[PDB]
Amino acid sequence: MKWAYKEENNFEKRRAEGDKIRRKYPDRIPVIVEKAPKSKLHDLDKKKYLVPSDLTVGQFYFLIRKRIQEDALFFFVNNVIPQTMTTMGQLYQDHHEEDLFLYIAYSDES
């Protein structure tokens, strides 16, 4: 999967922003959210989120679903589906990339 955010911004640009966000938002987790390319679901135009580190994956599903519009929704992070009760702070620690961002893909199929 290629991420529009990464096609638009090279590593220098992403890491510079990740450095700044981590300094100014210690309490929050930066997340880039994009649709798996072959999913029939609606594509998300607003893809950059700063979420409380104590928010859980399941709370994030609820908020993202609210922006995506009978269909199943699954998150993939580094090719695994996270547990809904995991906090976004823990998910970030385990899954963030070296630009200091967390990338979550979503699809209608497991």
Binding site: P30, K47, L50, L63
Partner: peptide, 9 residues
């Protein structure tokens, strides 16, 4: 586009 604070403090 602009980063989006999601959910209140």
């Amino acid at each position: 586009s602009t980063w989006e604070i999601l959910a209140d403090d």
